[PDB]
Design a binder for this molecule. Structure first.
Ligand SMILES: Cc1cc2nc3c(=O)[nH]c(=O)nc-3n(C[C@H](O)[C@H](O)[C@H](O)COP(=O)(O)O)c2cc1C
Ligand SMILES: Cc1cc2nc3c(=O)[nH]c(=O)nc-3n(C[C@H](O)[C@H](O)[C@H](O)COP(=O)(O)O)c2cc1C
Lengths: 358, 358
């Protein structure tokens, strides 16, 4: 099952292995470079059917850190062209996750503190969010409450980002509405205390996300997969209520043209108790897939080939996202093919490699 | 031992893992491209201390196949510059093997026949060698016997190639005098039947190789490792006599400025019986190292970490060459570090990967 092709709209993936977006923190002023080119081209040659580029900021203040990639200008977008072309040359589908970090923005790289940048550090910047409330813990900075014009501008930033991704050659797009960043924070009652049209009720909290999706849909080709990542629960003691609302939003996403949903955890606040475990997201993703009748993918621990295979065979997911295993071994798809006893497993790789490994 | 640094001349390798030259057959008219750039940069980031670029032809007719890389012009050399710089940026030492296929030239890619190109194929060309005798088997073409001027020209081609490698930024060079190609064929009595100064006696058969080394030494920096690969035996029923002569030549190489010898098998003729096995070259390399008092490396089956470690600890080799395992997994060095229980094994890789794998 892991090596069966998958067709969504006009795009066909050679297998069900998806490399989820994984920040590299190697960009400068949002511009990607040879780190990203080699990293991504190398992964594409590894055999995966889909390669989704890391969270790319739609605006400067939407970066998580000073090392995050951006696509807030045509120059930023053009930098992606040679990479997109190399990914296609390798036979993998090029995708990209566009995002805005919201209150979790202006933070240090993970190996450089992983915390909000100091007030007197020249690299930092003011964060924006639905309400002026801090995440807490290692991200204590209180963000600035967005005005209606800030909301209009951020939506347009997402539109510009999607238009740029389209013209750069990407064939798959993912809106980052998860992990406590801007989109996720608008949906969660923990972070959204607004009393206007963008806060309060389920309809109001969903508004920013739905309007952004609709706005993006106007510029994103209808024959190319339009997707999003969304945290459907927080493990904050309100899981049943939260999951029910999240599933309802997933239904609205589908009706609004979403082709597939990447199911994740919210990470909206720090006071939670997440039951980490191999493929622990499987059951949750399956319920969303079933109740919203929408294709899904999920991640965490699927680097074990048999787990990926099992999840697909049980129809818990349509695509299996494998992250860290690809950082350890960019040719994981080849390792997986061997593990599952696929015929001519070495040919998951290009001839220059395959010929000698068969 | 595998992760102990190694200093040769002014160059210091971060560990004892060497990626031996491995043809990719992806060049066009000798010009390398993004296949090579991503392939090599990716391998450098994998952690290996030394990365030796594939056999690069010193002349067009010296290519093994139409897909072989070349460095017979300054334009060809300049194409290597960005790759060399990416390898250095990753902290690996950039090396390159310069070569001339001799009678084994003008052959099809391994996955496209692996045999001598048909007479009426527009991609083929006449081969040259010490004597007009064919390898046989899948390489039946009888090569043209070289004139003294052909020999003078090929030597100059090696000099030009080394000068170009130097100016491109390479910090390690390897002369390809093995695997039945031109250099190896001049030394072997099987292929060399000349009756002039370049054939007959041990001194005459060694002449082409020694003169080429001396010529290259004039342009190659004295503070950068000058090495060569040489087949010390053929497994043709004349191993003791052949090994004795090969060791004597190794002594002449050392006296002539060779800093390290990559020990291999001759592959000069097809009628042999090679005892393939994991690290089977270990004992032979050790004897050459001991009797010629020259640093050495060897390959075949060292992809098993414990074998590489064992070979180093027993002083059979100074560097361990790991080939195919790197095609399967460009991050083999990381796999090896874990296998051998190295402290902070994930940091064999760059921060963007290491931080998440520790
Ligand atoms: C270095 C690194 C960068 C990541 N970057 C992103 C990102 O930009 N956007 C996102 O939605 N998830 C991101 N994630 C979470 C991964 O996409 C994935 O869901 C997670 O690693 C769990 O899968 P795994 O167990 O296969 O690694 C990242 C994870 C790591 C380790
Ligand atoms: C694709 C491929 C290309 C190779 N190219 C070269 C070359 O250009 N020059 C050379 O001396 N040896 C070459 N070799 C032989 C390797 O350097 C190495 O000695 C051999 O693969 C044995 O080591 P391994 O068991 O670790 O793969 C090649 C081997 C493979 C599989």
């Amino acid at each position: 099952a892991l090596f069966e092709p998958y067709t969504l709209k006009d795009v066909t993936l050679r297998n069900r292995i998806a490399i989820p977006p994984m920040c590299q923190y190697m960009a400068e002023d949002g511009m990607i470079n040879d780190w990203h080119h080699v990293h991504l081209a190398g992964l594409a040659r590894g055999g995966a059917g889909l390669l989704v580029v890391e969270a790319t900021a739609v605006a400067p203040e939407g970066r998580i850190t000073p090392g995050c990639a951006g696509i807030w200008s045509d120059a930023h977008a053009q930098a992606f062209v040679p990479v997109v072309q190399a990914i296609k040359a390798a036979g993998s589908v090029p995708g990209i996750q566009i995002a805005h970090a919201g209150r979790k923005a202006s933070a240090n790289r993970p190996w450089e503190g992983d915390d909000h940048i100091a007030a007197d550090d020249t690299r930092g910047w003011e964060t924006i969010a639905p309400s002026a409330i801090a995440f807490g813990a290692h991200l204590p900075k209180v963000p600035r409450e967005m005005t209606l014009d800030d909301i209009a501008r951020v939506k347009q930033d997402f539109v510009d980002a999607a238009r740029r991704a389209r013209d750069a050659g990407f064939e798959w797009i993912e809106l980052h509405f998860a992990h406590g960043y801007l989109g996720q924070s608008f949906f969660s009652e923990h972070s959204n205390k607004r009393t206007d049209a963008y806060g309060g009720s389920f309809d109001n909290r969903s508004r920013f996300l739905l309007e952004t999706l609709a706005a993006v849909r106007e510029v994103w080709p209808e024959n190319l997969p339009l997707t999003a990542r969304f945290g459907v629960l927080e493990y904050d003691g309100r899981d049943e209520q939260t999951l029910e609302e999240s599933i309802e939003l997933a239904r609205r996403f589908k009706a609004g043209g979403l082709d597939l949903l990447s199911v994740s955890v919210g990470f909206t606040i720090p006071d939670t108790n997440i039951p980490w475990g191999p493929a622990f997201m499987g059951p949750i993703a399956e319920r969303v897939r079933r109740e919203a009748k929408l294709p899904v993918t999920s991640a965490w621990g699927f680097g074990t080939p048999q787990l990926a295979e099992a999840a697909l065979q049980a129809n818990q997911l349509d695509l299996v996202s494998v992250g860290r295993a690809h950082l350890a071994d960019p040719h994981w798809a080849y390792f997986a093919a061997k593990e599952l006893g696929v015929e001519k497993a070495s040919w998951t790789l290009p001839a220059p490699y395959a010929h000698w490994l068969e």
